[PDB]
């Protein structure tokens, strides 16, 4: 059985950082590309990062490029998404997904209309101008 488990979500002050992790199991990690996606209520799901465990290629849309960085640790079958300089509009459920990486390299198409093979259940990220009001 395949599982993708996201963790690292939370509620953070605007300008702050989070690090999401995607724990993968049940498939040959190095043969796949892992994408991070997000969906906020009222919007369509969108790709925020791609990393290929096969060729090391990465892709980020302009909305997050420079702020978010994906990395892969094959010893743990984990992919991370370091998110810096978070903005309120980055609030969303974040999902990780996997797709066979043979014959592809990371682009907007891979994390867009191409489709993924496996999906995680998602982790909530909330970015607040007044985080102190919630804890």
Numbering used by the authors: 1 to 135
Question: What did the publication describing this PDB structure actually write?
Answer:
The type VI secretion system (T6SS) is a machinery widespread in Gram-negative bacteria and dedicated to the delivery of toxins in bacterial and eukaryotic host cells. The phage tail-related syringe-like tubular structure is composed of an internal tube tipped by a spike-like complex, wrapped by a contractile sheath and tethered to the membrane through contacts with components of a trans-envelope multiprotein complex. Nanobodies were raised by immunization of llamas with the purified periplasmic domain of the EAEC TssM protein (TssMp).
Two nanobodies, called nb02 and nb25, were selected for further studies based on their high affinity for TssM and on their amino-acid differences in the variable regions, suggesting they bind distinct regions of TssMp. More importantly, large differences can be observed on the CDR3 regions, notably in terms of size (14-residue long for nb02, 19-residue long for nb25). Analysis of the SPR curves indicate that nb02, nb25 and nb42 bind to TssMp with KD values of 66.8±2 nM, 1.61± 0.1 nM and 1.76± 0.1 nM, respectively. By contrast, the TssMp-nb25 complex does not bind TssJ demonstrating that nb25 interferes with TssJ binding on TssMp. This result suggests that nb25 and TssJ share the same TssM binding site or that nb25 binding on TssMp causes steric hindrance preventing TssJ binding. Analysis of the peaks by SDS-PAGE (inset) showed that peak 1 (~ 90 kDa) contained TssMp and nb25 (theoretical weight of the TssMp-nb25 complex = 98 kDa), while peak 2 (~ 18 kDa) contained TssJ (theoretical weight = 17 kDa) and peak 3 (~ 14 kDa), the excess of nb25 (theoretical weight = 14 kDa). By contrast, the periplasmic production of nb25 and nb42 inhibited the function of the T6SS as (i) no Hcp1 was found in the culture supernatant of 17–2 cells producing these VHHs and (ii) these cells did not have any growth advantage when co-cultured with E. coli K-12 cells.
